[PDB]
Design a protein around this ligand. Structure first.
Ligand code: DGL
Ligand code: CL
Ligand code: CL
Length: 255
């Protein structure tokens, strides 16, 4: 006879490239889903230095890619995509689509629970320029905020630079004459890879807000998700050299 997917929770995760694995890791370890389809646009990455129209266009193409999979919802792991493409994605999609920005703001408010505390948001140029984090935080009365583009962190992470003198110099470059924040929002998929180094740089007064952990808490509240028995079945796709993506995933997720 014939069986089709019954009660199985299958979702898509989209990112501009490999960075989004940091979000995949959180979703995977949280045991929320039975199956996850990851797609990274590695042929065209990065998005963070490009313009709104291009970013939106690329995301809508990604939505097209996913429509062959019958997913229950789509997570936009990419902070840059989350900053620009959500309206357009939702207008087209007939399943829920969630980005990581709202979640990250919510996580920051839970961590600080004091609108007077200092927040530093670090992200790509496009994300900062969107003013999405700034507007959300301001609308909640959190006005003690700095928003800084720390663009070089993206290719440094891709080159495997997670500590050392060169990374210290990049941190000094971006953070010179910056006040030490009470919370640092890692508003870019690549930035958790630098978390240990960022925390050492700023010291123990600074709480790091991880976008992947944030979206996990957000999803548990917004959707009806029972914890699953096993880890999800993972499928990886990429617009270029998918084997490299899988390799990085095996390392980052300890598969
Ligand atoms: N995925 C992007 C970083 C890499 C890129 O610029 O595309 C983000 O989270 O902002
Ligand atoms: Cl969202
Ligand atoms: Cl908000």
């Amino acid at each position: 006879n014939l069986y089709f997917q019954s009660n199985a929770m299958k979702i898509g995760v989209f990112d501009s490239g490999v960075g989004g694995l940091s979000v995949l890791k959180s979703l995977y370890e949280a045991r929320l889903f039975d199956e996850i389809i990851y797609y990274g646009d590695t042929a065209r990455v990065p998005y963070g230095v490009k313009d709104k129209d291009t970013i939106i266009k690329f995301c809508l193409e990604a939505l097209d890619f996913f429509e062959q999979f019958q997913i229950d919802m789509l997570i936009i792991a990419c902070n840059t995509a989350s900053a620009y493409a959500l309206d357009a994605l939702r207008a087209k999609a007939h399943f829920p689509v969630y980005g990581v920005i709202d979640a990250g703001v919510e996580a920051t408010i839970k961590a600080l629970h004091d609108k007077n505390k200092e927040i530093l948001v670090i992200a790509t140029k496009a994300t900062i320029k969107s003013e999405e984090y700034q507007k959300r935080l301001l609308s909640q009365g959190y006005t003690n905020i700095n928003a800084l583009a720390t663009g070089l962190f993206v290719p440094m992470v891709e080159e495997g630079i997670f500590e050392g003198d060169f990374l210290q110099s990049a941190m000094e470059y971006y953070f010179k004459n910056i006040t030490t924040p009470d919370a640092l929002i890692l508003a870019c998929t690549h930035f958790p890879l630098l978390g240990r180094s960022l925390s050492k740089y700023f010291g123990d007064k600074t709480k790091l807000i991880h976008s992947g952990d944030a979206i996990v808490e957000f999803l548990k509240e917004r959707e009806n998700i029972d914890l699953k028995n096993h880890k999800a079945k993972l499928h990886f796709y990429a617009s270029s050299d998918v084997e490299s993506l899988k390799n990085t995933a095996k390392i980052w997720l300890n598969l």
